[PDB]
Design a protein around this ligand. Structure first.
Ligand code: WDM
Ligand code: CAC
Length: 501
């Protein structure tokens, strides 16, 4: 079979499973950058406040249009002068960006941007780029102070805080990121913002990887769409940090349901489910540089995700980022060296009562394991359980109103994670958060069968979360702690034998 377990049609999905949303309102823990009283389906949201207000401090985004962005001269005036010039050749765009980035004129390479424009695009495509797309991107970037009128707080470590902004606001911010206008976000040896991801796009322009043209095609598809017709919805970014984590060995909860399949993807076949982003602790990973696996791909096809890098501090072990409302603008095939932009995508997702696409993505970063056996250390297993639990738990929500989790081999492949361990870890965290699991093994049919078989074995024997966790601890002591780079017996065979004996 191509899938095993509970039929996916029986799993909960938004919007059907959700409760009616409360009235959208700003508060101490929720920044809302648009006029809620004027929010109407199909209408571009109106910014609140009406006139630009600036904060230039350690708790908010430093906006390029701030009067405090100086060089003294006004860097925003210099950005305007630089970008309001005709572009006909890629050197013109390089020269423009460097006019307000003089300190980086010898550090920043533009080879990929030059090669995209001169050596990848056909003549008519290049002409469309410089006669239409780039000027429209400049115009939306320079409109920033009229679009993003409210200071944007940083989602800093240990904050439980949400930001809800319009897709149009995100588009203006991302156009600024493309033109590398965000101040204090560039230096290799910076102290301020050293714990934040890169936001300016200069590393997308570096080098000769065949991957860069594909990334640029994907992002220009987005920019062409959102400059031609303003998107009308909202997106919410929520940093969540939990303090009370389960005593896993004592957890008496049963496992929940499982659908596991070797076909399909999280983003296409997990519509309306909690979709896992296999994140880097710096959210988005190398999306703005050289990375092109699961997280970076999702950030390219749903580029509104990228703006999380503007304001999201690196995730600590007990934290996640939850993004609701991002829209899919592109389709793709492959990954890494085989990644290719396929075509524009018209997102057909319903919107919720806050005009957010019914798409919820959670960024949870797995650990990297240089040594395979390090991941079976109890402290490391508990770390991964608590990370996934934080990503899945919604404190004030009945289980009946929680969608299934759509996930897969989180932290595996090149990152060193063991897929069978990581599947069981996510199954346990989902059970503790009272959510069902939809697991995509991404072509591995044997893994599908193994996960299904283990799940059915444990559920039929009524093993609790704590019973299973204790078996993981036994496996570590018996096969890992005193162990060769690999254990003598694998995890699932160990579990089967331990339980049946
Ligand atoms: C479940 N699922 C999975 S697993 C997935 N993987 C990728 S890209 C390859 C990748 O991330 N690697 C390979 C080794 O290097 C480290 C990790 N896209 C994915 N999608 C869309 C998905 O739904
Ligand atoms: C003596 As021992 C197996 O607890 O390291």
């Amino acid at each position: 079979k191509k899938w095993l377990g509970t039929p996916i049609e029986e799993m909960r999905r938004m919007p059907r499973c959700g409760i009616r949303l409360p009235l959208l309102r700003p508060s101490a823990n929720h920044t809302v950058t648009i006029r809620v009283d004027l929010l109407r389906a199909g209408e571009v949201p109106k910014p609140f406040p009406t006139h630009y207000k600036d904060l230039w401090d350690n708790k908010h985004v430093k906006m390029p249009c701030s009067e405090q962005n100086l060089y003294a001269g006004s860097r925003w005036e210099l950005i305007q002068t630089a970008l309001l010039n005709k572009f006909t050749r890629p050197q013109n765009l390089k020269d423009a960006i460097l006019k307000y980035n003089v300190a980086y004129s010898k550090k920043w390479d533009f080879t990929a941007l030059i090669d995209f424009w001169d050596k990848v695009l056909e003549e008519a495509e290049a002409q469309h780029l410089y006669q239409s797309i780039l000027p429209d991107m400049v115009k939306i970037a320079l409109c920033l102070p009229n679009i993003c009128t409210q200071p944007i707080p940083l989602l800093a470590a240990a904050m439980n805080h949400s930001i809800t902004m319009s897709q149009e606001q995100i588009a203006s911010l991302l156009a600024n990121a493309f033109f590398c206008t965000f101040p204090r976000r560039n230096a290799k040896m910076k102290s301020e913002y050293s714990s934040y991801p890169d936001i300016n796009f200069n590393r997308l322009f570096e080098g000769r990887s065949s991957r860069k043209p594909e990334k640029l095609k994907t992002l220009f598809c987005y920019f062409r769409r959102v400059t031609a017709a303003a998107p009308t919805g909202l997106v919410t970014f929520t940093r969540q940090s939990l303090e009370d984590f389960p005593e896993w060995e004592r957890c008496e909860k049963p496992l929940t349901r499982l659908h596991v399949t070797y076909e399909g993807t999280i983003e296409e076949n997990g519509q309306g489910m909690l979709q896992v982003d296999f994140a880097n602790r710096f959210v988005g990973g190398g999306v703005t540089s050289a990375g092109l696996v699961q997280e970076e791909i999702r950030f390219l096809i749903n580029p509104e995700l990228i703006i999380s890098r503007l304001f999201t501090e690196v995730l600590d072990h007990n934290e996640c980022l939850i993004i609701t409302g991002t829209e899919q603008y592109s389709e793709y095939t492959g990954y890494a060296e085989t990644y290719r932009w396929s075509r524009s995508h018209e997102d057909g997702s319903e919107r919720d009562d806050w005009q957010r696409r019914c798409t919820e993505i959670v960024a949870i970063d797995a650990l990297h394991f240089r040594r395979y056996l390090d991941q079976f250390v109890p402290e490391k297993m508990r770390r991964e359980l608590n990370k996934a639990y934080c990503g899945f738990l919604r404190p004030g929500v009945s289980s009946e109103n929680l969608s299934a989790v759509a996930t897969g081999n989180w932290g595996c492949g090149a990152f060193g994670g063991d897929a069978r361990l990581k599947a069981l870890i996510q199954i346990l965290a989902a059970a503790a958060a009272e959510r069902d699991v939809v697991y995509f093994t991404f072509g591995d049919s044997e893994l599908m069968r193994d996960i299904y078989s283990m799940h059915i074995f444990l559920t039929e024997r009524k093993l609790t979360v704590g019973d299973v966790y204790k078996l993981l601890l036994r496996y570590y002591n018996e096969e890992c702690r005193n162990c060769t780079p690999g254990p003598d017996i694998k995890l699932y065979p160990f579990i089967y034998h331990a339980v049946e004996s």
